[model samples]
Target: MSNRYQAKFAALKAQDKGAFVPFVTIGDPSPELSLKIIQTLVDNGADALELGFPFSDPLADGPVIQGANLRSLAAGTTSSDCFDIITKVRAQHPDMPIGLLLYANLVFANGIDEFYTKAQAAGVDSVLIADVPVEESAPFSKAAKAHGIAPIFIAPPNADADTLKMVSEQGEGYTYLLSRAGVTPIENILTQLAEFNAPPPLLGFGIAEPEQVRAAIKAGAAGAISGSAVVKIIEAHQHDEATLLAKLAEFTTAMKAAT
Candidate 1:
């Protein structure tokens, strides 16, 4: 069979629909509730997952997701626990692509090799170190290759090389593009994908609405990732699991309809 990312994208293409990937922190609020919340995402319509490892300092994340990490850590989430959670998620959705959006500190804390080893065993498909620059990503990239995990990367419009550096490296899953909807440059970035062996671009940041998802795909992206918007609902309904999950499914349902 093809890779999970490959399969998800191809299936969406056949349906003429863009994928709707959702990002969430594992063990947020509480570990037990978090699993059911994630299952809600998949059961509703999330095409794939971009999971946060719940670092103490998620500097790459905005305050909304930052709050999620704080809540996750406060609830006593650990590196090992995150993998165990993924193990269950993997068992639940055998064909879904699961990628991590994490920091370099957590990787070193677990030992780079050990981290990828556990991630692979848990059936994770990709790893994206938000804090690791492509220039300093050699060893990490090598480790990912060793574990059969795709080393994911970012290609913001600000990259100035058509985000050339990210695509030039050995990366896959999806190039997370930090975008809102500025045309000329973002549209131009789409034109140069063929020059390098880059994977399909996934629009991230400010993707809270169906119109935004439609626009991202119309702008030539294979999908869109919703981060802050997803966490917001959880934050609002933290006291009530039923309502939190209900709102979560409602949000994902609308987003999936766009795709």
Candidate 2:
């Protein structure tokens, strides 16, 4: 186990603060620029990271995140470049917990075990295939564990669910606490996660600002992830490289303090 998440959570617990994880697409503008963007995020006090791979079809993503994928792919960013960027990031931020959020094709395209093998080699701590359901996670899950990568899962909130059993009993690392039928789901279901023995919940989706990050944690989430808002910054400053990094640093600084 990388144990980076474990150590980070424990350290945050000591300060009575939750984690603040940021999400971005690897190789968004280009490999070199994306590396610098990621460096800015880490340099600005981000507690952990959730990186998305560029996919041709990102059905689950909103326009903002989808735009990220388009820009990355248009820049001719390949899977090889994605992992290469990750390798560079890992070398610089050895203690930061890095997780991947991508589609199943990206995994299968490289072959299941082989895909995870690359992730492990690149120093990824966790993998959450965006299109994979808990019911269909076995193959990927086993491969992930075999490679020392945590197989992350997503669900709105159902502590009594079979998915909960799989996440709690079969998976490792954190769970993405998202919503579908309603607004925020963390507050009411946060306590119930313990009953299912689930991993810590990091609520994403709809969390765009620092106060929202605070609200998510206040409602008992282990952390909050802001994807579109963060990516929006990158999207806005694509050509304005210096401004882009500065904005990301400023945004990360504000978000980290909220945690």
Candidate 3:
């Protein structure tokens, strides 16, 4: 059976169109508010929803996403709460592609097998465990495939052509091409993916502006992941669903138009 993410990917490919991935830390203010934010993003133009699983120790996140993680965790957003957000989001958007973005420990802590099962049940079509290395991707991918969730992998910019190709082959739903080698929130790394073959590459981590979006599409990225920008909007607006969605709509529209 094809997952929502795969179905959307086929549709986008048919149109020769790119996607917009909006990443937000779950339970930022409340489950209801987060769900509203997600629905608004999807209804407006987001091709996929990347819900961040907040951890106390976010080793790979930049300041903006770090703040989002801290705030969500401090507000008591646990693994279960993330599923609750998904449940609400899927209520109105059953076919929307949704991805879970988390660290490996989060999955292990919740039991990898159980996590995958619950994620599939909660309407998650894909998984992106940021800290999982290419050499150690078995357990996650195994369970993910068992439950029909796509296990996504990241290929850094500094990786050689062969390395990128290997990583691309491992990726299922799509390959998340990191914009840079650093932690997050960076600029000017779009040229790195030029050497690799296309695999529905998404320029994730630190793609904050329309200029970055343009750069990514020019380099042949299928999508650009905007985490910091969405998190910043959530922080600034708190639970103002209407206003937050309006801003996200404008931002996504500008990004789409820039390409």
Candidate 4:
């Protein structure tokens, strides 16, 4: 029984195209509007979604993403509320692959087993704990697997062989290949593309344009996840829902076209 991530990738492989994953923070602005924004993404052309569950401190994120998280948190977004959003989206789009990116503290605070179980029930396909290293992934991975959810891991461009090996062994859905130390860069992306193996690599961090998506595919990435770039569009048009949806639709369509 392949989860949504595996199933989506298998389908993309058959189509002979790489994936274009759009990343956003759930409950940004407000939860009600967030649903519509996500619907807009799917309607336009998003192949998969990497959604952030708002946390006070998002260590791995850039300023744009951190702002989104702050907005979501200010709007009172909770872990349970994020799961509710997932459940609603799942009811609407059963086949869409929805993965989560959050910090480890949230999981621990909720109790790892309970968190993964609730995530599975909420239609979450995979989870990436931004601050957890491969060395400490076993317990989380085990819990995720027990709940029939995939545990995702980041493979840094500068990671050693041992780290890569551990990521390969523990990671299940897809490998998040860091495009750069703090953001995506073509050179760093190329380095990771050359070095990463095991679960298919998806370049992420600083991707913002269609050309970058195409470049990632050309460099042998299975896909690319664009976060700050996409969130910037929302930040720019937060006051007008119609304009926000229109821009998101346009942006996602262009990125997917590259894939």
Best by TM-score: 1
Local accuracy by lDDT, each model: 0.86, 0.83, 0.76, 0.83
TM-score of every candidate relative to the true structure: 0.95, 0.94, 0.87, 0.92
lDDT of 2 by residue, 1-259 (tens): 2377788888888989988889999999888899999999999988889999899879988899999999999999999999999998999989999999979888888888778889999999999988878888888888888998888888644444665666666556787877411224445566666667677788887777787777777777788877888999999999999999999999999988877
Compared with the true structure, model 4 gives a TM-score of 0.92
Return the top candidate by lDDT.
1
Please give the range of 10 consecutive residues that has the lowest summed lDDT in model 4.
180-189
Cα error, candidate 4, residue 78 (Å): 2.0
Q: Comparing 1 and 3 by TM-score, which wins? A: 1
Q: In candidate 1, what are the lDDT values of residues 160-201, reduced to their tens digit?
A: 663465554557777877775533267777656645657888
TM accuracy, model 2: 0.94
Poorest 10 consecutive residues of model 3 by lDDT? 180-189
